[PDB]
């Protein structure tokens, strides 16, 4: 009964890219804002914005290349039934480095590559190809 809002967000992005929607919308939270920020920094979505005041909504502008969608596959890793925490030399690469693994580290939510450069691990939220 809506116990993983992060996977609901990734599902909304995946369904929007499958249905060729130009922008998706969802309820917002600070973790969703941080994941949208790391996706916008890595160039998978166009932009993102928050709308409400006391019931804030997150609007993500999906990105499409010359024929198709930019986000090829997006998978939730640390589901609430099984949380997954990896050390700084067990941070995996996704698509051998061409994708990113969003890693909630101890000093913020960032990519696997930024976590491996800074030298700390943490929870691994999702894989993006």
């Amino acid at each position: 009964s809506m116990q993983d809002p992060i996977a609901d967000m990734l599902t909304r992005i995946r369904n929007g890219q499958a249905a060729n929607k130009a922008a998706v919308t969802m309820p917002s939270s600070k973790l969703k804002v941080a994941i949208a920020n790391v996706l916008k920094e890595e160039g998978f979505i166009e932009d993102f914005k928050v709308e409400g005041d006391t019931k804030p909504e997150l609007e993500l502008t999906l990105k499409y290349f010359q024929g198709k969608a930019v986000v090829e596959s997006i998978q939730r890793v640390s589901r609430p039934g099984l949380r997954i925490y990896k050390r700084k030399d067990e941070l995996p690469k996704v698509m051998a480095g061409l994708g990113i693994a969003v890693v909630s580290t101890s000093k913020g939510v960032m990519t696997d590559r930024a976590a491996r450069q800074a030298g700390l691990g943490g929870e691994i939220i999702c894989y993006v190809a």
Binding site: E42, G43, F44, V70, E72, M95, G97
Partner: protein
């Protein structure tokens, strides 16, 4: 030069009023050796007629694929009807290690180093379709750089 490899000749039947009618179906791959591979399924009443039909069908519908010196770009998964092929780049010096029809696909496509497994069914038509599905779905650092709006070193640094 378009090298080509026959994979599986098979004898199929069709029961009619008189008796059975046996006909031969052939499955071939055709590749250039630099990132262009296609496959072709021919069917006729004689084996060389099926071979020529399969070669002329494989020569037309070739796909393109971007790959390394002899290697895949990243571990990919190709799925068709029955088969669940996993392919993965290897170090330089190891041969193509796959099974049967996948060995023929990765021979003629120009791949030289791959660790590859076939899960599920291992019918040759389905593993060839799964292998070419995985090769067509493999994406390159430069095309993902164009997809994400940055450079190759911006991805890899």
């Amino acid at each position: 030069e378009l090298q080509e490899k026959l994979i599986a000749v098979n004898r199929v039947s069709k029961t009619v009023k008189g008796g059975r009618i046996f006909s031969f179906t052939a499955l071939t791959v055709v590749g250039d050796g630099n990132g262009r591979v296609g496959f072709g399924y021919g069917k006729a009443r004689e084996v060389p007629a099926a071979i020529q039909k399969a070669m002329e069908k494989a020569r037309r519908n070739m796909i393109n694929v971007a790959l390394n010196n002899g290697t895949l770009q990243h571990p990919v998964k190709g799925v068709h009807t029955g088969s669940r092929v996993f392919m993965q780049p290897a170090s330089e010096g190891t041969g193509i290690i796959a099974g049967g029809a996948m060995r023929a696909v990765l021979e003629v496509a120009g791949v030289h180093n791959v660790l590859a497994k076939a899960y599920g069914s291992t019918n040759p038509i389905n593993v060839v379709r799964a292998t070419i599905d995985g090769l067509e779905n493999m994406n390159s650092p430069e095309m993902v750089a164009a997809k994400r709006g940055k450079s190759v070193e911006e991805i890899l640094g």
